[PDB]
Amino acid sequence: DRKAPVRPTPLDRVIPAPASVDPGGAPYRITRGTHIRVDDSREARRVGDYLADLLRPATGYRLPVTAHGHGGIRLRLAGGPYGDEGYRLDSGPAGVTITARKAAGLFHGVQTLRQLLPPAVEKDSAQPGPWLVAGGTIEDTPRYAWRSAMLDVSRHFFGVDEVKRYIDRVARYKYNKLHLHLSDDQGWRIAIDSWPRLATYGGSTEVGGGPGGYYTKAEYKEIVRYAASRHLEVVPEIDMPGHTNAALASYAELNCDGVAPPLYTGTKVGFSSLCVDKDVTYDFVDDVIGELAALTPGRYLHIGGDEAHSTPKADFVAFMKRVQPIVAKYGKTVVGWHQLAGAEPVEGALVQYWGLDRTGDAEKAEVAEAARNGTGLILSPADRTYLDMKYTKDTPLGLSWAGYVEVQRSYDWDPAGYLPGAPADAVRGVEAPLWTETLSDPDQLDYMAFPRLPGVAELGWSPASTHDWDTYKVRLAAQAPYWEAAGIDFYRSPQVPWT
Numbered sequence: 055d056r057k058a059p060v061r062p063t064p065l066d067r068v069i070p071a072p073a074s075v076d077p078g079g080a081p082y083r084i085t086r087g088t089h090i091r092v093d094d095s096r097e098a099r100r101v102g103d104y105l106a107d108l109l110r111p112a113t114g115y116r117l118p119v120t121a122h123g124h125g126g127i128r129l130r131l132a133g134g135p136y137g138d139e140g141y142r143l144d145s146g147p148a149g150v151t152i153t154a155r156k157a158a159g160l161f162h163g164v165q166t167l168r169q170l171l172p173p174a175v176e177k178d179s180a181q182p183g184p185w186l187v188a189g190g191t192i193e194d195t196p197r198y199a200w201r202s203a204m205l206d207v208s209r210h211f212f213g214v215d216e217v218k219r220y221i222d223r224v225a226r227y228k229y230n231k232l233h234l235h236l237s238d239d240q241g242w243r244i245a246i247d248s249w250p251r252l253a254t255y256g257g258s259t260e261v262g263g264g265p266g267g268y269y270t271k272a273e274y275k276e277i278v279r280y281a282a283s284r285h286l287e288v289v290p291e292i293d294m295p296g297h298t299n300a301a302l303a304s305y306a307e308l309n310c311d312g313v314a315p316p317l318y319t320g321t322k323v324g325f326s327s328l329c330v331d332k333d334v335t336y337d338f339v340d341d342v343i344g345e346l347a348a349l350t351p352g353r354y355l356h357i358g359g360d361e362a363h364s365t366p367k368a369d370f371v372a373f374m375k376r377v378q379p380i381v382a383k384y385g386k387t388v389v390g391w392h393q394l395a396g397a398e399p400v401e402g403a404l405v406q407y408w409g410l411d412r413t414g415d416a417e418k419a420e421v422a423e424a425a426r427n428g429t430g431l432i433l434s435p436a437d438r439t440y441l442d443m444k445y446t447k448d449t450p451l452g453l454s455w456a457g458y459v460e461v462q463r464s465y466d467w468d469p470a471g472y473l474p475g476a477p478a479d480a481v482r483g484v485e486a487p488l489w490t491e492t493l494s495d496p497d498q499l500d501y502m503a504f505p506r507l508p509g510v511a512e513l514g515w516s517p518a519s520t521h522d523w524d525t526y527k528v529r530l531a532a533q534a535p536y537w538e539a540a541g542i543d544f545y546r547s548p549q550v551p552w553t
């Protein structure tokens with residue numbers, strides 16, 4: 055009977071683990087007459103409608119959203135110790151109430167509520183339920199404010215609707231940032247009006263050849279809009295000065311020898327570089343960042359900086375000295391991969407660490423030295439949170455350059471002391487990147503993202519006090535029938551005792 059439990063989900067059985075769980079008393083039961091009652095604002099109705107949309111198919115209930123009356127489900131904005139993102143959830147026969155300071159907090163509370171409900175809530179046709187929500191109180195706040203998921207759309211392109219699907223997968227677990235890898239050697243995926251061939255030519259293929267694709271400005275604005283309605287701040291990346299072949303192939307004049315290389319359809323790295331010695335390079339960078347800044351309402355622009363292995367250290371430092379201030383010129387905070395830690399991060403910058411256990415002490419020290427010097431740290435170790443990494447040697451998709459990453463390995467660590475010598479106050483949070491050298495459709499994205507995606511969300515959200523593999527894997531095993539009912543393919547790890 056694992057498809058419809060006799061009894062409700064325990065109040066504590068939630069990913070991420072809530073900061074505080076106080077089970078007690080009888081559950082609330084949603085019945086055909088339940089109303090979703092919201093505050094009288096466009097943003098409170100927005101969350102209510104989002105909740106109503108999640109529940110209507112499987113309940114068959116009308117679930118009207120109103121700002122009058124005493125709804126059995128109440129989303130209220132109120133003072134409280136909940137920050138921009140925390141919430142309180144109270145549940146019992148008198149109703150479910152979710153209280154927060156800001157809409158993002160109500161939305162996060164919605165994400166807990168959908169796991170308190172039974173797996174049948176994922177179905178697109180009406181079900182018995184019963185629509186029970188365990189009784190008690192959850193009081194929940196995030197440990198880290200940077201909790202991001204990356205999608206690589208350069209290696210294989212994914213259109214607006216496929217990004218919206220992936221957006222909805224991550225929203226489940228209280229991620230608050232969506233990092234988009236918009237350019238690389240195999241693709242340029244954002245239309246730039248000052249440099250139109252970047253999209254029309256540089257976007258014309260992908261890994262393995264054939265059609266590629268790109269986002270018109272309107273498509274990209276719709277992605278940003280959609281992400282925002284799921285409370286994801288979009289962090290765009292234009293990788294530079296390496297991983298730049300699609301741009302180089304698009305404009306001969308950007309190449310140091312003035313000859314445009316061919317379009318790249320392979321799956322290797324390191325061979326491309328912008329021309330640090332040419333003035334146009336910085337005209338090009340300034341136009342691109344300018345246009346991307348304008349499309350970007352979030353606070354951050356990612357300039358990459360990884361694997362510039364055809365850029366000698368001194369030219370790479372030079373290049374980064376010049377381009378970093380362009381970002382603040384257009385009003386944004388710079389993010390780079392942690393190679394930037396070795397080219398003088400500007401005030402306010404963050405760096406994303408993608409090293410592994412085999413990384414050497416000198417490289418890790420450079421990153422911890424930048425932390426000491428005030429650079430924020432985003433942690434995404436390649437042998438922890440790279441969702442493109444194989445689980446075992448038998449995984450059919452993915453890469454293995456970082457070894458194999460089973461479910462326990464991905465989950466079982468503490469960002470706060472992970473980097474030797476790094477002040478734990480320098481750690482802004484975690485990211486789970488999903489690179490697409492090997493992935494070309496959304497079902498494939500799912501199989502590599504699930505089941506590790508929730509775990510990295512937990513490292514970003516939950517108190518370290520709640521961290522424990524043996525109890526976490528029980529909570530994680532409970533997702534199986536939810537994912538099955540939703541059509542989310544996932545790797546049935548033997549380490550996880552699946553429900």
Ligand SMILES: CC(=S)NC1=CO[C@H](CO)[C@@H](O)[C@@H]1O
Binds near residue numbers: 360391440442491
């Ligand atoms: C910042 C990083 S990770 N650079 C890269 C190396 O590893 C990834 C493969 O896992 C690849 O897609 C990407 O270009």
Ligand SMILES: [Cl-]
Binds near residue numbers: 118
């Ligand atoms: Cl209606």
Ligand SMILES: [Cl-]
Binds near residue numbers: 122
């Ligand atoms: Cl009233």
Ligand SMILES: [Cl-]
Binds near residue numbers: 156
């Ligand atoms: Cl908000």
Ligand SMILES: [Cl-]
Binds near residue numbers: 180181182
């Ligand atoms: Cl029914």
Ligand SMILES: [Cl-]
Binds near residue numbers: 138199230
């Ligand atoms: Cl925030």
Ligand SMILES: [Cl-]
Binds near residue numbers: 222
């Ligand atoms: Cl989903």
Ligand SMILES: [Cl-]
Binds near residue numbers: 321322
């Ligand atoms: Cl190749």
Ligand SMILES: [Cl-]
Binds near residue numbers: 321322323
């Ligand atoms: Cl390679």
